[model samples]
Target: GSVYDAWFSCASNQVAQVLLTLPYSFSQLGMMSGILFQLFYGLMGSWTAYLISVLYVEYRTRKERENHVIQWFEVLDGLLGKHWRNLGLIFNCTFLLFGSVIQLIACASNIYYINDKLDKRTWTYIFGACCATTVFIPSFHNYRIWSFLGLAMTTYTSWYLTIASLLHGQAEDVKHSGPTTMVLYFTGATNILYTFGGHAVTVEIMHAMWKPQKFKAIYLLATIYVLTLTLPSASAVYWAFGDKLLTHSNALSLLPKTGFRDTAVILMLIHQFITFGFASTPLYFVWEKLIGVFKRAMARLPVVVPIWFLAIIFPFFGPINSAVGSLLVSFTVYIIPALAHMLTFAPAPSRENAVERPPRVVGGWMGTYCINIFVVVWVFVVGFGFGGWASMVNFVRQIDTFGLFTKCYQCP
Candidate 1:
């Protein structure tokens, strides 16, 4: 009864399922169309892959309920084989740590924008303190409070962003005209993939649900909600200010200086606080595991405190710049899964579990190779090509007034 009820309860937690969607949306939309294209192709080509995974799960469940280690090793082994799984694990673990640090920096930057008097370091410390509390408090006892905290954040953020968009009013700007086609389409697509592809994380949460059968319904409802919220919100931001909207990294600042901005700023800070707390838990776990294995005495150290302390100290380093959009959408969502599917199910004779034969090879590569090509092209075109072109125009305008370029060309 306890185990069954746990699954049912976890399945009913729709908000948790939705929370996983936000990270990719924040990281991908306006960032990675290339990855989105790749994901689409991979999803389309992977019927057999899913079957194999399901069969493996069933086999494991029947054989060794608690001792099965294959699930943990499969993805890593699939990607790089046994010899390199450890390296991949290290990379993955480290990536999460650094990723959380960068997110903290972003939160600090937003806080700075909202309250000019609070220096970045001060906000970082405040956020860090909040994160530390969440981790230690939840770990020692029931973590239901953490769930409510996450829910509070999701609610406030959703409301603040929605209201801010409404108050900002509507107006089209000519400056946004040049890149309208690329920006609008790519942004929309990226948002969809980023928000929905979080199915990976949601699968884990689903296992904890009390009503497992309701998961499909809940997931569908969440997807609809994401579309309803993000699509219009993105449109409102773009329509109201056009290219100027992109100027403010903190989306709330673009709103009119009414009560909405203040509310938004407060809510965003709270959201970030909770988010950092949640992200820090895994970072601490990884740290503890590593130390326990390599340095037993040091392993006894409280991992959560030091992990958050480092995050707080690192906010001055500027935003964590990367091809987040590309990595999340294209690589994480699309290419990696596609390769897994191909490796796990392809080659005709060994394709016993395959639902369908792999696509024909064009010179030994899958015919679906075009998908990877498309992803590469889309990333270049949208991420660098358009975003770069816009930045170049802005750069030229600023320098042109100085007569620097004209002087170099000997032009009056």
Candidate 2:
């Protein structure tokens, strides 16, 4: 019963990786760019990429099954060799840890934004303690509670959005007449990347599922669930307020000045608690692995200690720091996994029992090489250019919204 429940709970948990972060990321990117960016770049582009990546993984998994490759780790072992597999493991595990830390920061920052009464430092401590107790503590036993928390948080977030939209008259007067050419394109692309670019999480889930026939069904179900939950909520919020919807940290904050402010704030706190559950998982995994290696004596010390420490340090770094850190974590965890899959699974020269050759452009492997090079350069440019510039702009905007106009000529 415990194992079955754990499996079901873990399945639910996988959805949170997309649900909690994706909307927040969409809103953040949309605010930085515009509504156009939110639609195309943020939503379509990311989701499309995710579909492609998932299909590819399914294909690979099927091939492995045909060829007697049982476990997912074996695929890694084949490509990178045993020694370098450790390298991949380290990269993935560390990235997961870093990503968790960033989520914790987001949890704290959002809480601070919602409640003016609570001091940032106080909230940080409260969030850290809460995460440590609920998430980190139960993690070693049955982590299904974490997934249940995600489900609850997601439900609250959805409710909050609905209330905000209806109570605030957000659906009326939703359209904006502002310039949208470039911003719309970029927002769409960013949304696409942010939403569907979660290849690492997808892969991890797929591997856990492991059944050959169920892959497509699971992927489809997950995608539909994400779109149903996130897209409608985002569209409603944007439709309700247009550009003004971009002002709030979370969509719920845009709710009309009403008696429900306290209720909305409470919902947000619960949402953060859910996010902290997510944040704690990876941090616990990393701490357990690291400390388990060197200090077997201190293994009794709970994983919550390091998670709390990380939560305090990172969240207080402020919004820009949090954003940049998250971007790095996303690229490392999501984008890199997809890239690695493409690279490591490419057709080999002296193939003995190789699968069908993947499609080639021109000049054989050299063409593949060039495409990878282009991707690397583009990632650097976009990562540093879009992400870095956006972070700086947000920082400045936080200081003085009017001041951003003075430096507008220098940007873009």
Candidate 3:
């Protein structure tokens, strides 16, 4: 594929339906902390994504290997060991599963906006059924067109949000008192982690690149592009909506209704629909490879049913978003890349395999080790330890009503 194709896939994959919730993340974080965390996660995410490319190139350098590494877990399997690989695969797939569920709930929320008669749970199942059609898609490579289309949809939606929020100003009768509790702030922090969750597919995009060596540059560009969209739109919406948005996960819902608002919601619905397939594609690899599955249609039920059930039970987009990011993405995006890169290029005594390895981190060894160690500790301490605990607490606390297929009170 051309570099542009890879770029589209990269940006499209990262700039997901969850981009809408960033305003809520900012609401939880407040202004100063929100800006700092956004920049922090973006730069840190870019570095880890680049590290994945370094490992990808090193993995490709093996003379004994026949095929390119398509999945991020494959890199772990080759470099780390089967145990880390399985854990990585399981965590990665779990993230994807919840990602698809988020897309489903977001899409249903939008559809519910368009027509108020049908509840979101009903709409969720409808969209879930529609998403099962993605079974026809054979591989990650096939997602290029869908990804491009998704990019276009999200571009329009982001700018629409920016303009709408700027014009609309803060939601009426709402007040911004002060910064939230540490638990709330950390829960919001995970949403930032989720925003850069593209690392799960970093190797897949790099593997598809015609000029794989250029991946670091491509991934960097993709990160910058997404940050530009997410940060500005998120800040604009947060500035406009303030504390009013804290209760709303999808900020689009907070905007007053109009033909224009409905159109934006429709575009987001389409974007989420497209993203559902993209997110769930990695799970297909898991089912087929592990169980030796046949008839792709049958394989899809296991994937779709779980997402459908989960989306119905927890239609709370904000909590689920934070939970997924804190619990799984903490490991997949931040923790693993740093750990894997350090292990991949560590000095000979720790290395056990014959596989070719990068001589060292691109910079001096001491700085690299320090940086990698710091990333692991920070993610483990802040991202996983605090973020994970707070997100789970937030999630459980918000489930005020517990029942199968509960109505989404957010819907009008």
Candidate 4:
């Protein structure tokens, strides 16, 4: 099922990162509030994914005589217009570039997790550069065949995390464990958004779908399965360890140095490497398209190299994960889909129309207009508005903890 493909594409990248970290929101917001907000985010993500699938159907059917629009930015152009087309491209590339930075730091962080002897600053730079090294290979994009490895690893890690949580929770003389709780606000809205926010790849995945209409059902079930597998680990870990979970936000520090923990950390590092290859492609794709610069050497070097530069500066994964998630994902998952829904359902009048017929939208009165307007407002306000503020605020504060741009250039 195209939906299944979409689900796995979304899942392989997100389940590992999110399932491990989602329960952190419980620490910030209690259980009830946590569950409520998470449900809201998950539902919103689902609706958006479903909405995009609808757009995919239109693109396929509407373009029946012409080349079907397979690309995301092209769909934006068809639905919204040229301006939106440009904006979609911009946001998609920027978001993916930031993904590269996150990936670089992640690989370095995994190294720090398993090997205590290495200075994090030094290895972060080394590993950061290492992630970029793949780009040097011509057609490195072919390596995505190994993406399935991420699927297996994500499941195992989540399973291991759950088992570890149970083991640790049951251990004698445990501390920081607390009662059930709730909160009114969307805590870690960005990280949660990232967890639920793999819609960027939805269109591409749908384009690959044999029968795209079935995507929604496949999408819904895949999300539930992925979330079921991954989220419990994070929540259980949080319940087991409380705020002590913050000491090692990646969940690596929570375990002993037994051989088992080392193997899991190795898996984590390898997973990042595989996903980073696919994630980095959007940046290079857009770059080559914009400048038409193919053969120029070092053209794509900045993508991974500066990631190392930034990782040394602000290495806090959990918060920045949310910040980046909210920052770009609002556009990828929320804004673009809302705009596409509105434009497809309730198109604005072309200026050429001498008699401007009042724009007609579907779902009369409160149906189409209300739902879309709410998403627009939510994306703008919570997503871009407050979400950006909160993430950047915490991002800078985290800088104090890691101290930016100091010295990977230093040594033995």
Candidate 5:
């Protein structure tokens, strides 16, 4: 795949399901704080992605071969040793599997909002079958058309919401201040983190590209493209509606029902299905490899059915995904990249290399060692420590109120 094709894949993967929850996340932080956190996470995510690419490129150059860089864990295995690789595999698989369930619930929620006649469970079953079609394409390189279509669908929906919210006008008595509680605050914070959580699949996307070294540009392009879509949609809707938008995660549902809303809903529905397939593709790869079978259709059944069961049982979109983001996604996006880079290629203080020749590394020793350490502590302490605690609190609160599978989306 060309860099252009890879851009679509990366962007589509990054901006899935999480895009709808932006306004809700914004509602937590008010105007100034929300946008700042959005930019902070976006720029930090891009930096981490750049870190992974540089590590991969350097690893490949040293090995003088391409095969060692196939999977993300392999990169960690070579650089950080087998222990880190095994750890990476556990986190990666858990994130991917749980992410598939999140995608399924998001897909069904879109349908329920578009048409309220059928229950969400029925919608989940239908979409679960639709998502199974992903088994046909066995590799990331073949996702060009799907990625392009996914990007187009998301773009249309993003613009539609942005324009609609601008014209809709701000609601009266909207709250500008964020919530004061710890659980509410960090639930929104982690939701924002989840928006740029596509770093898990970074190396895989780079491996698929014809020119892997050019992936930094692709990552930057995709980051800008996603922020362009998400920032406007988030800010516009939060400005127009404010705190009242918190009742639902999917921002489109709050809009008044009309032809415009319906069109956006349907486009977003297709987008969810497409993104769900992409989200679960990595799991399928591992499943096939482990089983040593080419049973394409059968491979998807286990993956899709279990997630469908999960989506059926636990359908709290906002709180559930927020918990996963703080607990797992934060590690994948922030912790692993920084920790791996420091272990793998961070220049030591030794005089042989000095600071002169390793000029490609920004800030020489300071940026390489200092900033990476700061990132590791910040992510672990702030994100995992505080954010994880808050998400769990919110999750338990949600469960206490909503109970198990009671059509939570229907009320919103």
Candidate 6:
């Protein structure tokens, strides 16, 4: 009956990832710098998402005339061509599956909190085994029921941390933090960037809307909702914790030992258990759509393998979230969407659509096309240049310092 369900579905990941990023950003950038980075990227990423929503609007508006598509890959293929489409689709699927892996490891991996002496790698194996069961379930329809549950769980837990921070998110709980080496505030930007990178799925919600006209409203409200939780909470926790924030331990884990922290962590596990299915579905569904690889057992392999590999290879939840945000989120959320608008609204004068348009439309659109090109270029610089470089340096530094495949039993 309304667009709220669809809108919230897309925004769920934003809320889900906050626990991963909050500690890192505030710790790295300090109180004042952290909030600025969040706002700058929050608004900038919101604008990027707004452009993507605009692209979504145009796609549906001219679906018949342009023979455009509902799926993001299909849209890329239609506008750009097969090669670019495949590349974009590959990034899209890889990131979603990798994201599933992040949840695969991060969410259930916290069950170690139940018993700390448990070998974290052993928990990874158990988590992978548990994921094998979701394979028995089939189709997107199967996951829709989980959406409400995921949102409810995350909502309860979001407020749990919010209220918890208000009461006892003190630096007394924080372990240690003295000096910093933040060359650029880009790492903090990327941390915030992860929450706003839901544009890829946000557009797809419009495809299922009962009232497509309400998409703008849905987008506007969703952005507001995301910012409302993100900005204030980041400020609150940082204000309370100050110089002693925990980069490794999540916000929920840092709460005072009233057993509330344990309950909140459990809620997160339940939320991710429900949301993991949502993350992996894109690749499984895309593979089925493009290549018909929907076997009963075989279908599980695609979901299971990448997820298991990531869990085994790189189970560091905090770093993985930031890395994914820097690498793929930047590409998908920025470059791909810019190219989408460029190809659609501002095709070249020599192109098929523009060839038939008025001289004014062609000239004006050529200028718009050039500007979108700048967006693609500029976003690449910001994402890949600033955020990407900073993350890669930290990754290498961590690997050299703590070895690869290192267990994060205490941290996560």
Candidate-wise lDDT, in order: 0.42, 0.46, 0.78, 0.66, 0.78, 0.64
Superior by TM-score: candidate 1 or candidate 6: 6
Question: Model 3 has how many clashing residue pairs?
Answer: 1
Q: Give the TM-score of candidate 4.
A: 0.85
TM-scores for all candidates: the values are 0.60, 0.63, 0.92, 0.85, 0.92, 0.84
**Where does candidate 3 have its weakest 10-residue lDDT segment?**
350-359
Candidate 2's residue-wise lDDT over 1-412, tens digit each? 2333333443344333333333334443453343343333333223323433434454574555762212223345655467545655555555555555545555555565556576555666777665555542433323344555555555556556655665566445555533344332333333344444332444434443334334433444444455456665655565456655334434444454444545545554565455455444544555655665434224524655655566554442233333443355345433454455455645454232333332443354455445555544554555445654555455455546423212111111
Q: Which pairs clash (backbone N, Cα, C closer than 3 Å) in model 6?
A: none
Model 2 TM-score (2 dp): 0.63
Q: Model 5, clash count?
A: 0
lDDT of each residue in 1-412, candidate 1, tens digit only = 2333323322222222222223223332432343343345234223212322332333333344342123222444643367544643454444345545655655665666566666666766776655545544433112323444444555555656665666766664424432345433444343333333332233234434443334434444444444444444544454445455333434554555556566655655565554454445444555655665434323424654555565554332211223233233334333444444455444655345432333454232345345545544554555345543433343344345433312111111
- Across 151-230, the per-residue lDDT of candidate 3 in tens digits comes to 87777788888998889875466676446688889988988888884748778777767768777678788878888888
Q: Sort the candidates on lDDT, descending order.
A: 3, 5, 4, 6, 2, 1
1 or 3, which is superior by TM-score?
3
As for TM-score, the candidate ahead, 5 or 6, is: 5
Clashes of each: 13, 26, 1, 7, 0, 0
- Residue-level lDDT of model 5, residues 1-412, one tens digit each, is 8878888888877777777888888888777877877888887788788778877766665556444337788778766689999888888888888888898888888888877888777888788877777777766445545688888878888888899899999756867667666677788888888888564888877877776877777888898889899889988988988878777667877888989788877877777776666668888877877787656877656866778788888887788788888888888878988888777654453323321233354666556677788778877876889989988888887778877775645464
lDDT accuracy of residue 406 in candidate 6: 73
| Candidate whose lDDT is highest | 3
Worst window of 10 by summed lDDT in candidate 1:
403-412
